[PDB]
Nucleic acid binder design. Structure first.
Length: 52
DNA sequence: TATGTAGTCTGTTG
DNA sequence: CAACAGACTACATA
């Protein structure tokens, strides 16, 4: 089941700015990596920020 | 090194 | 065709 970037961020233990999260997606710090569906990313429920 | 704001620009949507 | 989500930025200050 998938979430928008904003909804995903809101449910994280430590929500950040939307810009920050978009940077994490571009740098591939999110596992599993989000799907870009048209103009928006779709995050799996379970996705997490990971260390590089 | 990491993040946040606030600006312009691009591709997708309805 | 206007509004939205994002790609990017300089700059500010953690």
């Amino acid at each position: 089941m998938y979430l928008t970037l904003q909804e995903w961020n809101a449910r994280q233990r430590r929500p950040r700015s939307l810009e920050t999260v978009r940077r994490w997606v571009r740098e591939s710090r999110i596992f599993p990596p989000p799907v870009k569906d048209g103009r928006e990313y779709l995050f799996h429920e379970s996705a997490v920020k990971v260390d590089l």
